[PDB]
Curated annotation (Swiss-Prot):
Residues 17-328 form the Peptidase A1 domain. The active site is at D35, S199. It catalyses: Hydrolysis of proteins with specificity similar to that of pepsin A, prefers hydrophobic residues at P1 and P1', but does not cleave 14-Ala-|-Leu-15 in the B chain of insulin or Z-Glu-Tyr. Clots milk. The keyword DNA damage does not apply. It comes from Cryphonectria parasitica. The chain holds residues 90 to 419 of 419 of the full protein. This is Endothiapepsin.
């Protein structure tokens, strides 16, 4: 089997991407944030504290003839930005772009933090990291991909995120028309539950490539590119007037600037992030200070190849017995 679904930016800055997902019988379609940096499929629901729902579409398990309470199971998750959610668990039928999993754990939110409430466009998350990170207790649950894998034509999914435009998540096949040149594969460590890999270095603009190992995670659920302070400083030093602002919480730059590209290595291959991908616009409405899309990972404890990096590539998440990651230009 295979599946294919379009993923769409939630706003003009590509702050996140949403993908429609069918849950239950009859189908209830919710727009979920596909997140290769976590492993829970959770949704706003009829159980979510009413004051914490503001415009989201909810899953109502009592209206699904295939929903079953997973007795005794609860979940609770916190993300890298300090947001969180928790609740109980149902199993139900879940379909993505024509690919159907029966008995998928659908984690129903009883509580969500303010960042989720305030984002009317995201109805929940669909985790695509390794199932070892799933938070359901006392019986850990499998991700949608893990459940689908054995049925797929090939045990893979691909992320093809657009810059200020829709893109695609495919399950079970590699669309050879969706990228240019060849796909370069690179080793993955699953030890921390992430799609963790080692980039071979970087360049800033038309500058020379610096060969240096950068361990990090491929994380579609993180907006920006978080890299070591040395790398980030080298980037922003090429932008007149750019500075790190403690009050704003990262590097900012004059909105009048033309940003240089940023290249990262995948083995001997190179992915080029155009400068415009690194512009996240005014820090506040009407400001001439703009927020940078490349930020320091210092104090995160891990480097993160988030959407800024991933959207410059066609990315293969290969879930074979020994997982790997593939990157192609597009």
């Amino acid at each position: 089997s295979t599946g294919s679904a379009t993923t769409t930016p939630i706003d003009s800055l590509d702050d996140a991407y949403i993908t429609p997902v069918q849950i239950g019988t009859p189908a209830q379609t919710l727009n979920l944030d596909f997140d290769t940096g976590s492993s829970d499929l959770w949704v706003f629901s009829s159980e979510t504290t009413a004051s914490e729902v503001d415009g989201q579409t909810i899953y109502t398990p009592s209206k699904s003839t295939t929903a079953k309470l997973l007795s005794g199971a609860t979940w609770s998750i916190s993300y890298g930005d300090g947001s969180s959610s928790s609740g109980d668990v149902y199993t139900d039928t879940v379909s993505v772009g024509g690919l159907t999993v029966t008995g998928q754990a659908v984690e129903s939110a009883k509580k969500v933090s303010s960042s989720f409430t305030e984002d009317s466009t995201i109805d929940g998350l669909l985790g695509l990291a390794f199932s070892t990170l799933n938070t359901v207790s006392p019986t850990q649950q499998k991700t949608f991909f893990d459940n689908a894998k054995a049925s797929l034509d090939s045990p893979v999914f691909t992320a093809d995120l657009g810059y200020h435009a829709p893109g695609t998540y495919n399950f079970g096949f590699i669309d050879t028309t969706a990228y240019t040149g060849s796909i370069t594969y690179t080793a993955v460590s699953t030890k921390q539950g992430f799609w963790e890999w080692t980039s071979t270095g970087y360049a800033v603009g038309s500058g020379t490539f610096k060969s240096t190992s950068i361990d990090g995670i491929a994380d579609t659920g993180t907006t920006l590119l978080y890299l070591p302070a040395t790398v980030v400083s080298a980037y922003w030093a090429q932008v007149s007037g750019a500075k790190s602002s403690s009050s704003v919480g990262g590097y900012v730059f004059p909105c009048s600037a033309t940003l240089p590209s940023f290249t990262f290595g995948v083995g001997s291959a190179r992915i080029v992030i155009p400068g415009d991908y690194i512009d996240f616009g005014p820090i506040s409405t009407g400001s001439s200070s703009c927020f940078g899309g490349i930020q320091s990972s210092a104090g995160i404890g891990i480097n993160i190849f988030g959407d800024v990096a991933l959207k410059a590539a066609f990315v293969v998440f290969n879930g074979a017995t020994t997982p790997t990651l593939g990157f192609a230009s597009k």
